[PDB]
Amino acid sequence: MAAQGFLLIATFLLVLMVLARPLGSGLARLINDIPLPGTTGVERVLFRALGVSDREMNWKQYLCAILGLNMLGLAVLFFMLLGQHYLPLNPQQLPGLSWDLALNTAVSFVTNTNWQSYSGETTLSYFSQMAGLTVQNFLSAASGIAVIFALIRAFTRQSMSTLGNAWVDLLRITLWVLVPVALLIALFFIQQGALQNFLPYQAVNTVEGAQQLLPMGPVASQEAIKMLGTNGGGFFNANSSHPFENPTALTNFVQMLAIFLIPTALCFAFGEVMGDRRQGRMLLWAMSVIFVICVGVVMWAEVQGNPHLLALGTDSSINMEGKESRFGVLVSSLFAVVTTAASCGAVIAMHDSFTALGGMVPMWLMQIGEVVFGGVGSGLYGMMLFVLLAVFIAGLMIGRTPEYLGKKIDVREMKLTALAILVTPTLVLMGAALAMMTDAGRSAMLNPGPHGFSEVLYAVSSAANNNGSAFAGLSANSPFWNCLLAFCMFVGRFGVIIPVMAIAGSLVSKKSQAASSGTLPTHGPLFVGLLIGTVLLVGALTFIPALALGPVAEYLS
Amino acid sequence: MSAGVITGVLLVFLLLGYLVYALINAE
Amino acid sequence: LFEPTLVVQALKEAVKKLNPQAQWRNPVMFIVWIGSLLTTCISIAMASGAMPGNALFSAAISGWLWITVLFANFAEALAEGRSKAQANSLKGVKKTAFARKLREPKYGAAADKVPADQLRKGDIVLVEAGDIIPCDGEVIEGGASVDESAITGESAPVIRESGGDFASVTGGTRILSDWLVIECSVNPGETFLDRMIAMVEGAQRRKTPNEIALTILLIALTIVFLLATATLWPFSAWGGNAVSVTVLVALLVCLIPTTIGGLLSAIGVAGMSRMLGANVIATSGRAVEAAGDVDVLLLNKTGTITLGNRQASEFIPAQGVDEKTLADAAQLASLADETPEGRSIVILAKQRFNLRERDVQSLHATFVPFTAQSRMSGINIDNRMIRKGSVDAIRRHVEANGGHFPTDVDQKVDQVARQGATPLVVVEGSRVLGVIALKDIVKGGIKERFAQLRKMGIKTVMITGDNRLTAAAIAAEAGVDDFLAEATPEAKLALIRQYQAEGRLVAMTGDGTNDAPALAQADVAVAMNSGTQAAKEAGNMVDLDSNPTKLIEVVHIGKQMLMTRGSLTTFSIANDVAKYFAIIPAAFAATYPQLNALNIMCLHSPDSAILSAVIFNALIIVFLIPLALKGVSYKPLTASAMLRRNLWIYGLGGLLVPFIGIKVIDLLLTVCGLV
Amino acid sequence: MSGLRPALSTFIFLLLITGGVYPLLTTVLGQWWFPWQANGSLIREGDTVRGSALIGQNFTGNGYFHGRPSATAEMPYNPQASGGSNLAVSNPELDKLIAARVAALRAANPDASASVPVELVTASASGLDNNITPQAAAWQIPRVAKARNLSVEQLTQLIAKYSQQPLVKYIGQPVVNIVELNLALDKLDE
Ligand SMILES: CCCCCCCCCCCCCCCCCC(=O)OC[C@H](COP(=O)([O-])OCC(O)COP(=O)([O-])OC[C@@H](COC(=O)CCCCCCCCCCCCCCCCC)OC(=O)CCCCCCCCCCCCCCCCC)OC(=O)CCCCCCCCCCCCCCCCC
Ligand SMILES: CCCCCCCCCCCCCCCCCC(=O)OC[C@H](COP(=O)([O-])OCC(O)COP(=O)([O-])OC[C@@H](COC(=O)CCCCCCCCCCCCCCCCC)OC(=O)CCCCCCCCCCCCCCCCC)OC(=O)CCCCCCCCCCCCCCCCC
Ligand SMILES: [K+]
Ligand SMILES: [K+]
Ligand SMILES: [K+]
Ligand SMILES: [K+]
Ligand SMILES: [K+]
Ligand SMILES: [K+]
Ligand SMILES: [K+]
Q1: C460 with C297: CB under 8 angstroms?
Q2: A425 min Cα distance to partner chain B (Å)
Q3: Is the domain of D159 the same as that of D78?
């Protein structure tokens, strides 16, 4: 079984690499503001009609563009979810959503979080999940890729004062990456069994007599772009575990590959845009080593499983509680750690019903920041937040001015790097403290003992980290939970995006040093180990007090 | 919640504000 | 050294800056100060009886946090006291005697009794035997033995000849002999010694951008740890009784990077101390670090090959003149050349070919210097009519006395001109004795100095600009991998701005005023103490040992400071895993008895583990004060190897040395039976 | 103002090109190409429907095959609130639930074994599940054989025929259907 896990990890990584390396040659093309082969005429007849000026703009106007687009998306989604009864495609005639749930869902879907505090098939109409939810599942990923494109342009541009044009950036990125691969994935899901029919809710009389009722709708169309990027909000309450969403193991493999496709291709594009593939394979190795170590510990914990099952008369002791049937223990464990490593938020196995050691690791890889392929677009700049600190410490050990890829790094972006790193644990710990100084938050408990505090910590980490994955025992339908998670979501997205854009604006002006004989090579195993040590050091030194009273306490129970 | 912890919360916020002020400042 | 036991009592008195006015400048330890005051008032009310408990635990925590603050301020104050001791060693006595001013500049003029603290620019002062220079300036005429041990550590009686390559003097140094005049250049209080003493005494120490960025990361880390240990209270209150405030404060102070937070000032105060101890006066730590980041070094040959004008002699080639007759000519020249440079040429010729046939007693040679109209020797007492002059000088001598000159001297001058050296000719009688070869020699160990520079990966460019052939030869027996022949000031500015515009950092170690604009345009500027005054203000740092390759020591110390601070902050961060392993199972043993399997150290009690952690936090600071004073040992290694060495030492010291420290301190506490 | 027209223009274009035509394009491809799987993967005879090939239904009965238990809120195997079980690994309530389930399964099956398959007593992740592992299906062969008067070898080859193996062994699990298998059992009976 350990050998089965070994081949699973190995072949998953090989298929991910061979599907992500060709996308790097083509994402670096998008970074370089070079049109893809076969769309120059379409681009020039499209942007003139759209009014997107070809002139470039600096970091302030780029950030203002992204934040204005996100505010408009939040307003449109909020005023669509507050209605949905004045709007068509409501076969069951679902009522209008409450203000708190509408605000929380709107901010979760716009700020790349996709946290479901409800049951989708019994609370949302077809029109919401077909148009309003799907456009945010597209544009949140587009905004993340635009932020990282601005950062990569800042790193690769010598002394220019502009980071490109955001409107043409998201337009090109969306229409030539996020749409057609989503078509391919969606048609594969229709091939394998995921439904997309727009039919009314079709009642079924079973072979016994208990009249159940099946849900329908545009499920696979939302599924495809929910897996592409790192969106991770499903059609139903059991997101990416319903048989109508990912019916089989080939679909689940496509789920996994679509989760890791965009951050790995972004790392490859970062390697190939500098002319030095070592600079990208450094980040890929640094992510993958932590990834495979955490996969190994999660699979080992879940194979050890529940000890009480053997004493209660079962043939095995693997933790099948809260796990699917056609997806094995190892496969669901790998999907759990992939989901909570890449900030996706789609869960096969219910993460709440895990062994303590297998449930600590998702909490850990969330709370260290979405760095291990973490998030669409975020997977590179959240790691750059730690790279700009690791290279600072390395330059301090050398005894020279700290520089990464030639450009000098100083106080004017050390302030922004420090602020952007500490804005995440601030939100996580403040929200987890506020949820237990109030009767609400402490009263939405499903499991007693340390697992309940683990549930609250997982929920606030998922809100602040733009993950969306849930210990689903928490009843977060209360207005206090909705408002708290909304605030955490908002600050955890736009207190990271803003300092990253400020770092990009400060870095694009500085002239890049060409080369020197004596600078530290930021590609070798020493720098990979230093970056890994930094990630496992800060991000664990923050939450070992937070993790000791939950999963560690119930593991040592 | 009750009295005696509001002073701790206020002092923690004051320390955080002072530390953020020192972070932004280049003293 | 570390503890001389002279001023330790005074600096321990100066530790008491515990008031909030002198503590908020370091926030990473102002948090420690506020936590110490908070746990102290908790202990006071705890013993008074507001809340029930032992209060000895809280009293010990409060005392030990105050002890951590006291040794942090003790490290800072001891570094400051060492800086003050260095400043007082460099002090001398600035105002020691009245100035012997002259109303009119002339040797043997109207004396004055003016004090030595109001002399203005362009003031002439007479200096007799057994005297001392009041203020810095330059000489005009004369010169003799001058010792500078009391200022620079060099007891060598370096002369101060009028004009030439060195003519500038520094105040406050002993004079051994007579015949010294000095023209004042800058006012008292405008000199770099007084400026260094003022900035040490003022102790402002405007922090480098690297220091500010490291402080920013320390602030971010202490915000993170403050929020973790502050939000730890509701999490503990959820399950059973909450953890007490004293344990939270002690855990917070343990997690705060206290060691580097205390030694951040010392790393840099000891940097200034090692500047002053390396005979270098440095203005700013930013300049020190930029000098530590030098990749390209610049020099001139006027300070390398015997400091110029004292070139050696090479066999004295001549046409039709035998070697023994050339040696006789060298002997006759040794009975002449009463100038100091001429006597240098005399002793070089004598050590080239010793001859003891006749001396100054057997041949009573007239000791007269050259004549200003023709650069001619006035000696005629020998059998041959002696003339010591250049080519034009000896031509004028030919049509003054001998009539017409042959073409042999012309073609010999042409051969010397195409071979280099100097065209000065020694002539005795009516026949020339050959043009003396005066090719220079590279004095000192500058070859291995440049080898060390190349090993450290610093470019060495040699800029004088005489001709391409002799520059190639000077590079060949010097060690610079390139040079710049046909050098002009505009070419120097163009080359230095091209190097600064190509993505490299530069440094100049010039002496003159002609290259002073380029030296001031350089982002790293090393001024020559033997160099010109205006260049000395134009510089950023000045070296007082008259060594062109003092920059290697400047690079060593400047890199040592950054390496020390980065290594110490990495060690302080890496200790926190062990501090978790010591505190958290003990901190939560009361309300989470299942967590008592995490203390792998097998510590005694929860009331002892926290004391052991805080005691280790204080003792690691007081043990790393010597590491703050003396920097991390620099070895000439590449970046990857040196980063690996720094990791293998200090990152491995983290997570391993705190294990031993906490375990040994807990063992000592159990042996003493205090807990 | 500064860029209000490009912002609103790209918002309307991105909305109309991602939500509104992309679901429409995928749907008009789905019903044109793969209509059974696109329209719910329903299984039916005549006009009435007996379920899909993916959902799974509550099967209370000795004759019928039994799938994994469901932790759906208001009714077991109800496709309205697919939430699964969120009980902790150390929950005593979970311990009582698993003890009750294993006692009920031991009372139901008196001939196979005392070590029940783990998935037959542990709830599914989605709250509804149409499939179980073939050894767990073979565990309840004596019960269905006694309740239907059918051969053990015949039932074994039937569930081997109605299995579902993945493309490669390690990527998922070999697994057999439940509702479709029970419908095949009913058609075999009559
Ligand atoms: C417990 C067991 C494990 C213990 C530790 C053992 C560690 C080794 C494990 C395997 C990792 C090998 C990864 C590459 C080797 C490093 C060399 C290098 O410079 O990399 C660039 C490498 C070759 O560089 P190059 O030779 O200098 O060529 C220059 C080109 O510009 C670069 O472009 P190019 O060469 O891709 O372009 C040409 C390419 C055309 O392009 C393509 O075809 C697409 C991209 C190539 C993908 C093919 C390989 C994918 C690499 C991922 C490997 C994952 C395996 C999982 C590990 C096991 C799980 C524990 O055609 C080829 O020639 C493709 C072959 C590439 C040669 C090197 C790959 C070795 C084969 C992988 C091993 C087989 C797995 C079996 C199990 C391993 C157990 C020992 O290029 C790539 O393969 C690109 C993707 C890799 C980038 C980094 C990804 C991180 C992977 C880490 C894995 C997880 C950690 C390991 C376990 C940790 C402890 C538990
Ligand atoms: C601090 C406490 C402990 C102290 C330890 C200090 C350091 C450990 C040194 C141990 C041994 C000393 C002597 C070794 C020297 C000779 C070996 C050599 O050639 O150089 C290798 C390397 C030095 O690299 P370099 O001199 O920069 O470049 C020379 C390269 O050969 C040329 O560069 P390249 O890129 O062309 O490399 C060629 C080849 C690699 O060729 C080699 O040299 C390796 C030999 C393998 C044969 C080639 C097969 C290709 C496969 C790729 C490499 C596989 C290695 C293992 C993979 C599984 C990963 C577990 O790889 C590739 O083809 C390119 C792929 C990109 C790099 C591969 C990344 C591998 C992962 C390395 C370990 C990461 C996990 C460590 C966890 C740390 C957390 C605790 O020396 C090491 O062994 C270092 C490894 C790092 C260990 C951990 C570092 C400790 C840091 C943690 C704490 C951080 C503090 C946090 C700061 C505070 C936060 C607030
Ligand atoms: K997400
Ligand atoms: K972050
Ligand atoms: K963080
Ligand atoms: K993030
Ligand atoms: K979820
Ligand atoms: K940090
Ligand atoms: K410490």
Answers
A1: yes
A2: 13
A3: yes
| Residue range(s) defining the domain that contains residue D70 | 42-189
Where residue C406 sits, what CATH number does that domain have? 3.40.1110.10
Q: Does residue D68 share a domain with residue D18?
A: no
A213 and chain D in contact, CB less than 8 A: yes
How many of the other CB atoms lie within 10 Å of CB of D48? 8
Domain boundaries, chain B: 1-27
Side-chain-side CA neighbours of residue D176 (13 Å): 23
Say how many domains are in chain D: 2
B3 touches chain A (CB under 8 A): no
Cβ contact A531:C568 at 8 Å: no
Residue nearest to atom 50 of ligand 2 (CA): A525
Nearest CA to ligand 2 atom 40: A525
d(CA C301, CA C303): 5
Question: Atom 100 in ligand 2: which residue has the minimum CA distance?
Answer: A534
Q: Alpha-carbon torsion C282, C286, C292, C295, what sign? A: negative
What is the best residue among C644, C648, C650 to mutate for testing ligand 2's pocket, by most ligand atoms within 8 Å of CB? C644
* Residue among A317, A352, A325, A321 nearest A336 (CA): A352
Phi, psi of A146 (to 5 degrees): -70, -40
Question: From the CA of A496, how far away is ligand 4's center (Å)?
Answer: 6
* Whole-angstrom distance, CA of residue A459 vs CA of residue A449: 16
Q: After which residues is chain C broken (C to N over 2.5 A)?
A: none
Resolution stated for this PDB structure, in Å: 3.7
Cα dist from A95 to A122, A132, A478, C355, C419, whole Å = 10, 16, 18, 120, 103
Under a CB-based contact definition with an 8 Å cutoff, are residues A389 and A417 in contact? yes
Cβ within 8 Å of residue A388, ≥6 positions away: A404, A409, A413, A417, A503
Tell me the one-letter amino acid at A235.
F
Q: Which of D189, D73, D65 is nearest to D138 (CA)?
A: D65
Smallest Cα distance from A138 to chain D, Å: 7
Strands (E), C213-279: none
D26 contacts A220? CB cut-off 8 A: yes
| Tokens of residue A148, six digits | 């990282």
Residues D108 and D15 in one domain: no
- The distance of A279 to chain D (nearest Cα, Å) reads 32
The greatest distance separating any two alpha carbons of chain A, rounded to the nearest whole angstrom, comes to 80
Residues in C closer than 8 angstroms to B22, CB to CB, are: 27, 219
- C-beta of residue A316 within 8 angstroms of C-beta of residue A309: yes
Residues D97 and D126 in one domain: yes
Do D30 and D13 share a structural domain? yes
Nearest-by-CA chain B residue for A422: B20
- Shared domain for D26 and D56, answered yes or no, is no
| Domain that includes residue C416, residue range | 324-436
Do strands C124-127 and A407-408 pair parallel, antiparallel, or not at all (unpaired)?
unpaired
Residues 422-451 of A with CB under 8 A from B: 437
* Residue type at C56 in one-letter notation: L
Of B1, B23, B26, the CB nearest to A437: B1
Is D136 in the same domain as D156?
yes
Residue A515: CB atoms within 10 A of its CB come to 9
In a mutational test of the C interface, the residue from B1, B15, B25 whose CB has the highest number of chain C CBs within 10 Å is B15
Residue C169, CB-side half-sphere exposure with 13 Å CA sphere: 34
Q: How many CB atoms lie within 10 A of CB D154?
A: 11
Distance set, CA A551 to CA A362, A443, A453, A556 (Å): 11, 20, 9, 9
Question: What distance in Å separates the CA atoms of residue A5 and residue A329, rounded to the nearest whole number?
Answer: 10
Give the whole-angstrom CA distance, residue A176 versus residue A67. Answer: 22
D22 and D100 belong to one structural domain: no
